[PDB]
Write a protein that binds this ligand. Structure first.
Ligand SMILES: NC(=O)c1ccc[n+]([C@@H]2O[C@H](COP(=O)([O-])OP(=O)(O)OC[C@H]3O[C@@H](n4cnc5c(N)ncnc54)[C@H](O)[C@@H]3O)[C@@H](O)[C@H]2O)c1
Ligand SMILES: NC(=O)c1ccc[n+]([C@@H]2O[C@H](COP(=O)([O-])OP(=O)(O)OC[C@H]3O[C@@H](n4cnc5c(N)ncnc54)[C@H](O)[C@@H]3O)[C@@H](O)[C@H]2O)c1
Ligand code: HEM
Ligand code: HEM
Ligand SMILES: OC[C@H]1O[C@@](CO)(O[C@H]2O[C@H](CO)[C@@H](O)[C@H](O)[C@H]2O)[C@@H](O)[C@@H]1O
Ligand SMILES: OC[C@H]1O[C@@](CO)(O[C@H]2O[C@H](CO)[C@@H](O)[C@H](O)[C@H]2O)[C@@H](O)[C@@H]1O
Lengths: 346, 347
């Protein structure tokens, strides 16, 4: 079964790379071998780089796949000592941030006996009883249990929580200078700044499994740049998250929030307008929900031109703001999940 | 036989819900089994027809307004076979449904075999032309024109009923003006919007679906409820394959630009729904906003739990096309199993 998934991957990659049937066979030969010698096989560095790009390209729930081939992949399968591991994490965050103009990065670690990461994202705000991000409560209790103690504000950057093989779980705090943050303000509603809201620049998912032709990489944090509604609608407004609708509505001076007023709806638009332009002011990359969809159309065009069909999960590709104003809203998608890809941990 | 299976499942589900003794159910199943052998199908007890229609609305996975299923006003018109009575029954439904603005949910079920045939998508819809009107009603408008119907050629020409009684040509019938309640759209804060001369009808009456109850298919059974703001303010007015009014409306709201990062497109959308909502309110026509409708759906789920029934649904349709994250249904999935009785699109 392993060789079967492996074969599938090699064929697709090489066919897409216009490789002579000849070498394809040689490669399958080499693989079939070490699968017997070992139990699994090892991807060439070209396959690892191409496999991760393909995984992003098959990520059905991703609206930003237009830039899939832009991924900067880092082979860290050899990282086994604490110093180099930590060094690789900070390097990723530093190179991804790129002084504001974010760059797609993925740091792939060893598929077996490798560094384990417990964070949902390399960068997240703690979640406490009376403040913080409710979604990060679990990971925050773990941090505290380990000995970590944050300032206790609404935006305490959680530390990297990791564990090397044959060692206990540890946590590492990033120097604040490493994490770029964006104060949120509205150039038409002075009172918004008074709420002291802000968000980090780079979203680095570190709790998913990367699968390339049979091999499963349990640790391979990756990042892109935000799309307004992620911060302005879900992070800040979801009732199970920061749930700031009321405080923000006040900053916008809406005397009421009765459903009849449609102020709840106006507050959402304004908040995303503030988030977007606050990021723009800090020189940090961000894309608005509608532009993000236009870029997605191009992705679809670029794929059809390469003879590939487009898969996707409708409910995710559609933004939580003026969804009908996006092309993808008006038709369905084939949610078929292909390999390579990213999956949730069991 | 296949028919009896479905009739039985319906009878059992229904009578069980009404707490009817086992003997009552078995007696009914006998009578049904009997008349299927003697005639091909069976006839629904008037009670079964009324409760069956309500179970159909309650099982409709795509409907956010199911909290009111219990209140459906069912009209049995399986006896109507002549034209004059057919039309009369239509104006009656429209009359009762509208109720001068205090809209009431109604459904008229005609004969399941050899009954009146209806071609409209909704009893009330605006004509669709090549240079104006509702693009969605092009096909139906072509038919109306072919039959000799001729409208003033505006963006809002109320189409005529198009029907056909057995062994008779397809005809069209124009509703009296007084019969069709309409609402002019205007925004209190934006006087320029009135200048667009927009409006919409009060009652949404679906007339293009099949009602299925215990194996019995009722092809002609128009139903209605009242509108939820986004159906008009977002889809009907803004979809590019509908009236496509974003640019025009934006100008009425005086937006200097519609470039994406300006977010005016989104403000324009919220403002247009605010207009549509209060316009209906000003004219005294029932309407519910998207968020309020979703709150009522929460109640529906609470009531259904208390009745031992599970709730099915189609997520993408339940989530409104405006600030969907502000509705509870957006944050979890829904079992889209289609149970009977139910409504179906005509094949
Ligand atoms: N009232 C409407 O016309 C309406 C409302 C909401 C969603 N939708 C449609 O629902 C579809 C969503 O598809 P799905 O993932 O439920 O899958 P599916 O339609 O394949 O089932 C989209 O294609 C969208 O256009 C239609
Ligand atoms: N967290 C996110 O980014 C996000 C975005 C959109 C929709 N959703 C979720 O997607 C689900 C809707 O999916 P569905 O029922 O169409 O199918 P399904 O496959 O989730 O069942 C909901 O549970 C909803 O909360 C999550
Ligand atoms: C370049 C900028 C990018 C943009 C703007 C973009 C945008 C998005 C958005 C809006 C989501 C929805 C998140 C949510 O609301 O839950 C998402 C999900 C996703 N994206 Fe992208 N993306 C980008 C880069 C990346 C990269 C680099 C990868 C892969 C290496 C990727 C993989 C995915 C995956 C796996 C999901 C689903 C994750 C989940 O299940 O929660 N994205 N992306
Ligand atoms: C009493 C007020 C009601 C409200 C506010 C309500 C609201 C809605 C909404 C918002 C939709 C989606 C429309 C669209 O986007 O195309 C819908 C669909 C639906 N509703 Fe309701 N509804 C009501 C009454 C009814 C009644 C009385 C019935 C059944 C006898 C019903 C049957 C359905 C069905 C079958 C659909 C799907 C129709 C389609 O496929 O286009 N609804 N309703
Ligand atoms: O936009 C992509 C999305 O559209 C659907 C709608 O059914 O299919 C269309 O696009 C495909 C290309 O990805 C074509 O293969 C297909 O023929 C066309 O109808 C979805 O299947 C697809 O996910
Ligand atoms: O809300 C209905 C919807 O919820 C799901 C999961 O999203 O089912 C869970 O919640 C129901 C509460 O209404 C329970 O009856 C059900 O047992 C539970 O699993 C869907 O399956 C359902 O469509």
């Amino acid at each position: 079964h392993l060789f079967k998934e492996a074969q599938a991957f090699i064929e697709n990659m090489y066919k897409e790379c216009h490789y002579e049937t000849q070498i394809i066979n040689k490669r399958l030969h080499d693989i079939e071998l070490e699968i017997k010698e070992t139990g699994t096989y090892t991807h060439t560095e070209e396959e690892l780089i191409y496999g991760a790009k393909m995984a992003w390209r098959n990520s059905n729930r991703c609206i930003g796949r237009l830039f899939w081939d832009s991924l900067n992949v880092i082979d860290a399968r050899d990282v086994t000592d604490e110093a180099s591991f930590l060094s690789s994490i900070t390097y990723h965050i530093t190179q991804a941030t790129n002084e504001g103009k974010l760059k797609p990065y993925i740091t792939i670690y060893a598929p077996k006996d490798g560094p384990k990461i417990f964070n949902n994202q390399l960068i997240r705000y703690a979640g406490y009883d009376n403040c913080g991000d409710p979604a990060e409560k679990e990971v925050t209790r773990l941090a505290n249990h380990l000995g970590w103690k944050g300032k206790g504000t609404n935006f305490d950057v959680l530390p990297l929580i990791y564990q090397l093989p044959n060692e206990s779980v540890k946590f590492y705090e990033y120097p604040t200078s490493l994490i770029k943050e964006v104060p949120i303000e509205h150039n038409h509603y002075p009172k918004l700044r008074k709420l002291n809201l802000k968000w980090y620049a780079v979203p680095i998912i570190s709790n998913m499994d990367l699968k390339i032709g049979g091999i499963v990489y349990p640790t391979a944090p990756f990042n892109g740049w935000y799309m307004v509604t992620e911060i302005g609608v879900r992070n800040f407004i979801d009732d199970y998250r920061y749930n700031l609708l009321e405080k923000v509505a006040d900053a916008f001076e809406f005397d009421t929030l009765k459903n009849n007023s449609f102020n709840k709806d106006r507050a959402l638009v304004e908040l995303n307008y503030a988030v977007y332009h606050s990021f723009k002011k800090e020189g940090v990359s961000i894309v608005d929900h509608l532009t993000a969809a236009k870029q997605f159309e191009l992705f679809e065009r670029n794929e059809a031109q390469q003879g590939r069909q487009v898969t996707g999960k409708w409910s995710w590709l559609a933004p939580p703001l003026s969804p009908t104003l996006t092309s993808n809203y008006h038709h369905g998608y084939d949610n078929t999940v292909k390999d390579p890809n990213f999956f949730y941990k069991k």
